[PDB]
Amino acid sequence: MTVEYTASDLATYQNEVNEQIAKNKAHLESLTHPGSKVTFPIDQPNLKVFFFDIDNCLYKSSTRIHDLMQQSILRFFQTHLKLSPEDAHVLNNSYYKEYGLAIRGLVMFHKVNALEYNRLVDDSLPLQDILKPDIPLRNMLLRLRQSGKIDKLWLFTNAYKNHAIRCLRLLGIADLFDGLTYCDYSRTDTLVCKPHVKAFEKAMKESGLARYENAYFIDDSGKNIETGIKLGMKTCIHLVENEVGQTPEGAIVISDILELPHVVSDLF
Ligand SMILES: [Cl-]
Ligand SMILES: [Cl-]
Ligand code: NA
């Protein structure tokens, strides 16, 4: 939109975002529950690694998050003339599912500054209004961790690291993983993200996995699962919460991450 008070408006939007981010951080600082702090470093034999997508996987897809994200994108759209209405419409449908992949084209063609977008749209979101400590989840992941069958639980996400970290802390599962592979929005206009092969190569390198046959993978994106299968991962699990992209042949199909011990019980 072309407005009367452009400068005062953008400052106001940025100032509101500043205040909300400060509140978001203060909230995290207040947490004292198990799993409320990251216990692994960032950007660091027959090793077995289980890779986990985060969004819509470690928590159930939320229309509240979709709606909050849409409102956020709407405010961004109104203030950034480089985005078309179709760009914004597609983001409304896709960003809260695909994260970095959803902005990859926009970033490559310089219609969106990734860090600016992440701050105003993503880091601004009061995720604590939706994501709460999940004890059954914690207990399931701990069960996997302690079973003696898997060496590392590794996060593998298209979100930027702070979004990913917030999710782990809010859900009370931040001490259950050994590391995090995220989509780096910071200093390239060519984002590396799933389902692209280079994202998998990054996850392999960072986790220290040597052989795809020693990898396990759970994700809600059929196409991501497909890359995993074709790379030769041992078992890929396609999470489809609502059976309303297809499931690639060879994937196990589940509707809730708590189904995991009942579909790959050998690992538990
Ligand atoms: Cl592209
Ligand atoms: Cl584009
Ligand atoms: Na996901």
UniProtKB/Swiss-Prot annotation:
Q: Which CDD domains match?
A: HAD_5NT
Q: Which domain of life is it from?
A: Eukaryota
GO molecular function ontology, one term from the record: nucleotidase activity
User: Which terms under GO biological process does the entry name?
Assistant: nucleotide catabolic process; pyrimidine nucleobase metabolic process
Q: Which InterPro entries match?
A: HAD-like_sf (IPR036412), HAD-SF_hydro_IA (IPR006439), HAD_sf (IPR023214), Pyr-5-nucltdase (IPR010237), SSM1_domain (IPR052791)
A Pfam family of this chain: Hydrolase
Q: What family classification does the UniProt entry report for this protein?
A: Belongs to the SSM1 family.
Q: What does this protein do?
A: Could be an enzyme that inactivates 6-azauracil by modifying it.
Q: What is this protein called?
A: Suppressor of disruption of TFIIS
The top of its lineage is:
Eukaryota, Fungi, Dikarya, Ascomycota, Saccharomycotina
